[PDB]
Amino acid sequence: MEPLLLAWSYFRRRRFQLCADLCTQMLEKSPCDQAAWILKARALTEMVYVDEIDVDEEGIAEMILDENAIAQVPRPGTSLKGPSPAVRPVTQAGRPITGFLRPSTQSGRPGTIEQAIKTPRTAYTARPIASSSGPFINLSRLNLAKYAQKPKLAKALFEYIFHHENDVKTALDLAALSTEHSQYKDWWWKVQIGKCYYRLGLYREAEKQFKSALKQQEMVDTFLYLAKVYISLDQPLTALNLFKQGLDKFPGEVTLLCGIARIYEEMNNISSATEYYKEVLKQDNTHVEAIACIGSNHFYTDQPEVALRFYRRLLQMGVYNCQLFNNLGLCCFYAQQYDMTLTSFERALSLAENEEEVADVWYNLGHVAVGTGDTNLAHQCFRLALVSNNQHAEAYNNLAVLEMRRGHVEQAKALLQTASSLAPHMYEPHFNFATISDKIGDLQRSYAAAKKSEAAFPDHVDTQHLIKQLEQHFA
Amino acid sequence: SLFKARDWWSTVLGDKEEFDQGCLCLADVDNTGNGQDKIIVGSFMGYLRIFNPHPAQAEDLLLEVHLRDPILQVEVGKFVSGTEMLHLAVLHSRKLCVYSVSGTLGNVEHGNQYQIKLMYEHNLQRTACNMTYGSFGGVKGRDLICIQSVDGMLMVFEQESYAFGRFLPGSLLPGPLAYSSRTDSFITVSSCHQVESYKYQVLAFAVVDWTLNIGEQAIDICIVSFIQSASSVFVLGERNFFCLKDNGQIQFMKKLDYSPSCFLPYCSVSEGTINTLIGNHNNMLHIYQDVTLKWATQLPHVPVAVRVGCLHDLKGVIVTLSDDGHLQCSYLGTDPSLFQAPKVESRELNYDELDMELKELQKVIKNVNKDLKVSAMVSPNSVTVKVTLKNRVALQKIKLSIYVQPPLVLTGDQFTFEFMAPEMTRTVGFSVYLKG
Amino acid sequence: MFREVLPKQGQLYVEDITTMVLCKPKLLPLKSLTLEKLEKMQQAAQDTIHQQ
Amino acid sequence: ALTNLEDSENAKRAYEEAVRLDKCNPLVNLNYAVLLYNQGEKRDALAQYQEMEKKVSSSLEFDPEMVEVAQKL
Amino acid sequence: ALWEDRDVRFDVSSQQMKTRPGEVLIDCLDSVEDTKGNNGDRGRLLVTNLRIVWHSLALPRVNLSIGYNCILNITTRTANSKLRGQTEALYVLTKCNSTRFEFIFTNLVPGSPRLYTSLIAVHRAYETSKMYRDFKLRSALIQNKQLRLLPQENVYNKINGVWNLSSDQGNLGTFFITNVRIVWHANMNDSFNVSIPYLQIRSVKIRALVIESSQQSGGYVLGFKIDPVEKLQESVKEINSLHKVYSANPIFGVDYTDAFVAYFADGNKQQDREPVFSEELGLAIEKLKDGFTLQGLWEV
Amino acid sequence: LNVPRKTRLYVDQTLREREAGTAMHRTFQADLYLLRLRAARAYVQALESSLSPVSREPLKLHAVVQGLGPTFKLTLHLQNTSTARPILGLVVCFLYNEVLYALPRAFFKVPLLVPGLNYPLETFVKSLSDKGISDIIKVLVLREGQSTPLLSAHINMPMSEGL
C-alpha cells in the first residue's frame, strides 16, 4: 500500500520495474531519501545483473596480443592451449562439437589476428568476437570517499557501478576506499576488488585478493573465481587441485564438480569428464550441463537409446527449446523409435528463433530422409538448409554428394569447393573433392585436396590410400 | 507425470489481487485438535480468506472476510493472554489485529458459519514491514510478536500490549526477520549483507550477539527446530542458500544457479539432516537433503511462501500461493509415462486434400525446372536528368539509384519510395556534372 | 497356418569402392542461462532502439 | 514385412512388382503363393506355385513350405 | 444444461458448435492448423463468449470444443524467423474431470496473427466474472451494510428478516434479489451468506422458499422463511418470472471415438493413482506402479 | 573387438517395437507424408521468393563478411557451374537499410563468368548508426533483360563496434 513498502515488496518478488517506478516517484516527492535511492539502484542493477563467474568472452585481442602462460611449450597433457571426426562433427582441426554451449567456451584459439579476422565471427566463441572484452546517477558527481563510509550504501552502489554501468575504474576506487574503511577484514570487498582486477587484465593482482578472501571465509564464489584466474594463466592442474581442495571444504558441491569436468573436457580426456559429470548427476540429476554432455557422448558412441533417455529427462524437466527437440528427433530416429521422430523435428522447426537453427533442423531432416531413402526429400531439405543459412558447409557437402549420385559432376565439384572454402577444418568436402577429381583425373587438384583432408582429419584411412596412389603416380 | 506437481484442491483467489510472503499460513486456527490444517491467505488488497479444502467445490471456502486496510503476514499462534488456543494475527501496514475464527455448525454441510472476533488491536506508530512470533525468552504457553518496521525499528508485543521497541543498528532496507528458540535470538539480514543474531534479553535492555557476512541479502530466513539433536538456521539469499550453525558460521552452503523465491525446511528423514524445498522463479520446486537434490517438480506458477501440511487425511501436501492470486495444493507426480506415439485410430491422415496440395506444389517444382516502367529524360541544358517511373500493380519498398561513371558526379544518388497505389507516377530529378 | 520363409543370407560387400561421404547429423548444442540472458539483453536494446 | 503391417493390398502390388522384376529366385514365388493362400484365394496361389516350379534348391525351410503349399493346394 | 464452458469435446456435431443463446462469437481466423494431432489438416478457430472452437474447414465434422472453465494455461509462441514472417502458435493446457489435454494451433499464413491476443483478454474476462454463473458460500459480498453489485446487476427487492432453514441460531438475514443472482446474508456475523445464480437454479417452488440446484452444485436444497406469506408468494412469483426472463437469453457476464487419445498432455496417460504417503521423501506422493521405486525412478 | 553393448533400455525398446510395431509403422508413414508436404511447401516458397543461393541457368553465389569496426568488407563469391558455357549478361543488386549501411555501389555488372572459376566481387559496407544495430542485407543476382532475380543471398551484418 504505502510507497516504500509496496516498492520493497515488489523488489522481493523480483518485479524490478514496479520497484523503480514507485521509487522514482518517491524520489521526485522527496529529494532527501536514501532508502528508495538504493532500492531503485538495486532494481536497476538487477534488471541487468549477470554473475561475473560465467562471463569469460576474452576476445580476439586477449587470445594473441596478451601472453600470460609461463611455459611456452609445456608437456602435452598439462595445458589448455574420444570419437573421431568420422563419427562426431567437429568445429576446428580437432575439438569435437560439445553439448551445452556456455559463454566461457573458447573451443580452440586462432594463431594470428589475420586468421581470427578472416574466419566466421562465431567460430571461436558462443558469441561473435570483439576486439576488447535520463541517467539515474552520474558517476562523476558523487564523492566515493563519502559513500565508502556507509557500507549499506556502498555495497549496492558498487554493484550498480560494476554490473549496470560497467565502470571498472570508479568501481575499483569505491571498493578500495570501502576495503580500507573495513580494515581489510571482509572477504566481499576483496572478492570485488579481485573481480575489478580480473576484468582490468591484472590476473596475479586478482589472485592475491581471491587468496586473501579464501583465507577469511571459504565460499564457492571465491573458489570459482580462483579457478577462472588460474585457467586464464593457462594452469589447469592448479585449478584442479584448488577444486579438490574446495570439495574437501564443501563435500558435494555441484559447481565445483562441474568446473572439474569442464577443465577435463578442455584438456580433452573425456574418460574423467564423464566420471565427474556422473558425480554431478548423483548430486543434482537435473543438471542441464552434465545431462547434455553425457547424452551427446552416449549418442555419438553408437548408443543412441541411452542418449534418448538422457534427453527425455530434460524434456521431463520443462525444458522447451529448438535444440532439445531436434536432439530428441535425432535420438528417436537413430535409436529406432519411428513414432516420436518427426514430431520432434516439427516442434524444433516451430521453436527455432533464428535462421541458423532452422537450417540445422532442415539439415537433420535431410539426414532422416536420406536414411529413409527417397533422396529427393533429402535434396529439398539440404537446399532449404542452404536457403536458410547460406554459410552451411555440411549442407553443401551432402547436396554435392547427392548431386554426384544423380550424375551432375560439375555441380558437385562447385558445391564441394564452396563447402571446403567455408569450413576448411572439415575433412569430408576435401576428401570428396579429391575423390571425384581422381575419378576424372586432375591429380594435382586431387593431391591439393587429399592433403588438406589429411590436414583436417590426420588419422583417416582412405585419405592415406589416396595420397599413396597419387605420390605413386608422380613417379 | 514424472517430475510434475500433480494437482489437488486448487483455486484462483480474487480479481488481480497481490500477495507476498507471510500471506499463506497453514495451521489449526479453528482449534479443532484433529491435526488437519486449514489454509489462510491475506492480500494487501484487504481480503482475508480461510479454507478447509477437500479433494472448485463451493463449501471449501470457510470465509472470505474483507478488512479495510491491507494485510501483511497472517500468522497463527497463541496470541491471547489467557488461554492456550491458536489465534490468527493480521498485520496491516499501521495496524495489528488478533482475531479468533470460531466455527458454529448447522444441520447441513453448508449451514455452518464462521465468526472472526477482533480479540484486540494495536495502533502502529511506525509503518510495519513484517513480523515474527515465538515464546521470547524461556516462556511457555505464550506467543509474543516482534514486528519490524520499514525503517529498521523492531517493536515487541508481549501478546497483550506494547512491551517495548528498539531500533536495529545500521539497517536501511528491512530484510527477513526470524527468532531462534534454541538460542533465544532475533536473527535478521541487514542491508549490508550481514546475517546478524541478537540475544533477546540484550535487545530488551536497550548489542550484536554475532554476525556473518554472506555474499548477498536474503529473501527469507527460516529457523526450524523439529530436531533437538543439532540445531541449524536456514538463510535463503537471492543467489545462494546457506545453512548456518548456532554459533554463527556456515554449516554448509549451496550456490544455486536459479533465482529462488521461497523455501521451507520441512520434516526431515535421516539422522541429523534436514529435507528442504525451494521454489525457483523458473516455476520449479527442488527438494534437497541439505545440499543434495533428491527430487524436482515443475510447478504451475511462481511459488510464493510454500507450505507443507496434512490436508484432509493426506500428510505432506504442498500448498503454494502465487503473488497474482493463484493457489494450489499438490502432491508430487511419480509416474514415469511411456514415450510413445498415441494410438488414435479415429484420427486418420486426410489423403485427399493433402495430396491435392502436394500435387500443386510438386507441379510448381517440376514446372520451374524446364509491373513497373522506368524512363529517363536528359535536359538539353551540369545537366539535369529527370527519371519518371510508373507502376501497374501496387508496389512497395521502391529504391531508385543512379550510376553514371567514376569521373561524373551526381547531386543525388538514392531515392526511396514507400507503397504506391496502382497507376501512380513518380518523378525524381538530379544533376550530373564532371568532377576531375 | 503357414509362415512366410525369409532368406537366412544377407548381402555382403566383395570390394571397397570409394563413395562420396556425407556430412554427419548435427546435434544442436544447448545453451547456458548466462548466454540466453546476454542474448536477450542484447536484443532488448535493439528493440527499444527501434520502438522509440 | 508389409503382410504383417495390416496392409495386404500394398503387399499384393509389391509382390507383383517383385515377380515382374525377379527371374531366378523361387523364394519370391513361394512367398507370394503363401500370401495368396492365406488370403483365402487358393486360385492364383497355384499360379505362383507353378511359376516357382518353372523357375527351379538348397534352403532347408523353403523346401518344406514348397511341399506343404503343394499338398494343401 | 450448459456444457460449452465446462467440458472439452472432440468430433462435435454441427449444431453444438453453433452459438448458444447467451453465447456470442468474438473473433475468428481461417487456416489455423491443428497440432498435437499430426493430421496436418487446416481449419478455422473461433474465440466465442464461453469457449474456443476449432473446425477443420474442409471436413468440418472433426473439430474441437474447449471450455474456459477447463483451461489452465494459454501461451503464445512467436518463432519461425526471417525465412518467412513471424508466425505465432497457441498452446492451450486443459484439465477436465482430472484429465490433462494440450492443444497446439499453428497460424499457417503469417498475415493475420492478431486472434491469439483477444483470446487471452476474454479468458481474463471469463475468470474475473464467476459470481455470474457459479454458486458460492460465505463470500465477501456485503459492504458496510449493503450489497456489492456486479457490473451488470441491480437489486429488485430488498427484504429484511428472511430466515434460513439450514442452520439453527444464525438465521435472520436480509434477502437481496437481482437480475443475475439472488443472495442472502445473515445480518448477524454477516459472513454466512449464500449467492445462488439463476444459471444454477433448477426450480423455485414451495414446500418455505425451496430452491434446487442444477446437478452441478449438487442437490443443494435451500430453504428460507419470511413474515406472513403474502410477501412470500409475491417473492416466489417474481423470482420465477425473473428466472424465466433470464433463461430466455443468458448473460454470462463476460465483458469485452479415439480423438481424445491423441491430445493427452502427459503422453498415453489419462489417470492419477491414489495419492498416498511416502516414507522416503516425507511428502504425499502418487502411488508407485507395481514394482517401481523412488530411488530407481530418480536415477537415469 | 569393440562390438558395443546394449542395456535394459535396448531390450525394453525392442519389446515395445515387437508388441507395437504396427502403430509405429503407420505413424511414421504419416509423419513422412507430412514432412514431404512441408518440405515441398518450403521449397515452393523459396522458389517464389528466389532465396536459394545455389539455383539450365547454372550459378552459385555466397556472400562472406569480414572485419569488425564500422567498415566491413563484403565479398560475394560467385561461380558458374557448367560444363563449358559462359554467362554474359548478369548484374548484382544489393538491398539494405539506407539509414544503417552506406553502400557506395549498390548495383554493378559482373564479369563474364567462365565455368569453373570463383569470382570474388567485393564491396565496402559501412555502419552509420551510432548505436549498435545489426540489420540484414540482401543480394540479388539477376539478368539484365529480366526483372526476377536469378538467385539471392542474405547476410546478417554483425555489430559495429564503432566510436
From TrEMBL, chain A:
One GO process term, biological-process aspect: establishment of planar polarity
InterPro entries named in the record: BBS8, TPR-like_helical_dom_sf, TPR_rpt
Keyword Nucleus applies: no
Cellular component terms (Gene Ontology): BBSome; centrosome; ciliary basal body; ciliary membrane; fibrillar center; non-motile cilium; photoreceptor connecting cilium
Keyword Transmembrane helix in record: no
GO molecular function: RNA polymerase II-specific DNA-binding transcription factor binding
SUPFAM superfamilies assigned: TPR-like
Coiled coil: none
Keyword tags: TPR repeat
TPR repeat ranges per the UniProt record: 322-355, 393-426
Gene3D superfamilies for the chain: Tetratricopeptide repeat domain
PANTHER family registered for this protein in UniProt: TETRATRICOPEPTIDE REPEAT PROTEIN 8
Protein name: Tetratricopeptide repeat domain 8
Organism of this sequence: Bos taurus (Bovine)
From TrEMBL, chain B:
Keyword Transmembrane found: no
One GO cellular component term noted in the UniProt record for this chain: BBSome
Coiled-coil zones: 344-370
Domain PTHB1 GAE intervals: 382-436
Record carries keyword Coiled coil: yes
Domain PTHB1 N-terminal per the UniProt entry, residue ranges: 1-336
Domain of life from the UniProt record: Eukaryota
Single GO BP term: cilium assembly
Sorted UniProt keywords: Coiled coil
Protein name, per record: Bardet-Biedl syndrome 9
Species whose genome carries this gene: Bos taurus
Lineage of producing organism: Eukaryota, Metazoa, Chordata, Craniata, Vertebrata
Residues of the full protein shown: 2 to 493 of 882
UniProtKB/TrEMBL annotation, chain C:
GO cellular component, one term: ciliary membrane
Tree of life domain: Eukaryota
GO biological process, one term: cilium assembly
Name used for this protein in its record: BBSome interacting protein 1
Organism in which the protein naturally occurs: Bos taurus (Bovine)
Organism phylogeny: Eukaryota, Metazoa, Chordata, Craniata, Vertebrata
From TrEMBL, chain E:
CC annotations in GO: BBSome; centriolar satellite; ciliary basal body; ciliary membrane
Keyword vocabulary terms for this entry: Cell membrane, Cell projection, Cilium, Cilium biogenesis/degradation, Cytoplasm, Cytoskeleton, Membrane, Protein transport, Transport
InterPro entries: BBL5, BBS5/fem-3, BBS5_PH, PH-like_dom_sf
A Pfam family assignment: BBL5
Gene3D superfamilies the UniProt entry points to: Pleckstrin-homology domain (PH domain)/Phosphotyrosine-binding domain (PTB)
Keyword Ribosomal protein: no
GO molecular function, one term: phosphatidylinositol-3-phosphate binding
SMART domains: DM16
Transmembrane segment boundaries: none
Entry keyword annotation includes Aminoacyl-tRNA synthetase: no
Protein's recorded name: Bardet-Biedl syndrome 5 protein homolog
Lineage: Eukaryota, Metazoa, Chordata, Craniata, Vertebrata
